[PDB]
C-alpha cells in the first residue's frame, strides 16, 4: 500500500561526482536507493549556500518538508531531488515560472513543461504555456539538483496567463491521485 498525503513522493540523492545536466541526475537516481525519502508538500525550497548535500543544508532547503525525512543523509558534494505524484488542475492553460540553482525538469502527463538542462546561478525563468484538457489530478514529476554552491528551487504555476502565480503545496498535491484529507 502507498502512503496517501497532500504532497509529492520525494527522493533525495547525493553523489561525489559532478552533476552537469538532467541526464546526470537521472543516472544518479537510477544508480541506487534514495539517500532519503520525504513528503514534498510545499515545493518552495532554499535559498542556501555551501552545497545542498553538505551538513544540514538539505534540511534547511526543504524547510517544513524536512520533518518527513526518512534519514539525515551524510555529506556529498552534489545532490538533488526527484519528486513524483499528482497535482489537481482544472482544464485550461498554465505556465510555470521557476527560480532555481542549478537546473531542473518538470513533466506533466508525460510531457516536459519546464526545463533547464544545465547548471546555473540563481535565475528565474518564465516558461511557455501548456494546456490541461480535462480537470482532475494530473501526473507530475520533478527533477532538481545542485552541483555545488548555492541552491534554490521554487517552481510556481500560473492559471491566469502569468498575472498571478502559486506554489504547488498541500492545497492541490496528492501522492497517489486520491483526494487527501490530512
Ligand atoms: O555554474 C553554476 C554555479 O554557479 C555559481 O558557482 C553558483 C552555484 O550555485 C552554481 O551551481
Ligand atoms: Ca533509485
Ligand atoms: Ca546531512
Ligand atoms: Ca477523459
Ligand atoms: Ca559538483
Ligand atoms: Ca549550485
Numbering used by the authors: 10 to 191
Tell me, in the authors' exact words, what the paper reports.
MpPA14 (Marinomonas primoryensis PA14 domain) lectin is a domain of a 1.5-MDa adhesin responsible for a symbiotic bacterium-diatom interaction in Antarctica. Bioinformatic analyses indicated the presence of an ∼20-kDa domain near the C terminus of MpIBP that is a member of the PA14 family, which is a carbohydrate-binding lectin module widely distributed across several kingdoms of life. PA14 domains share a β-sandwich fold and the presence of two consecutive aspartate residues in a cis peptide linkage (DcisD). The DcisD motif coordinates a Ca2+ ion that is directly involved in binding polar vicinal hydroxyl groups of various carbohydrates.
Glucose and 2-deoxy-glucose bound the lectin with similar affinity, giving Kdapp values of 1.36 and 1.37 mM, respectively. d-Mannose and methyl-α-d-glucose bound MpPA14 with slightly weaker affinity (Kdapp = 1.7 mM and 2.1 mM, respectively), and the binding of d-allose, 3-O-methyl-d-glucose and d-galactose was significantly diminished to Kdapp values between 4.1 and 6.8 mM. Glucose, GlcNAc, and other glucopyranose-containing carbohydrates, including 2-deoxy-glucose, methyl-α-glucose, and two disaccharides (sucrose and trehalose), all bound to the Mp-PA14-Ca1 via their trans vicinal 3,4-diols (ionic bond length, 2.5 Å) in gauche configuration with a dihedral angle of ∼60°. This interaction is further enhanced with the diol being coordinated by the side chain carboxyl and hydroxyl oxygens of the DcisD motif, and main-chain and side chain protein ligands from L11 (Gln156, Gly157, and Asp159).
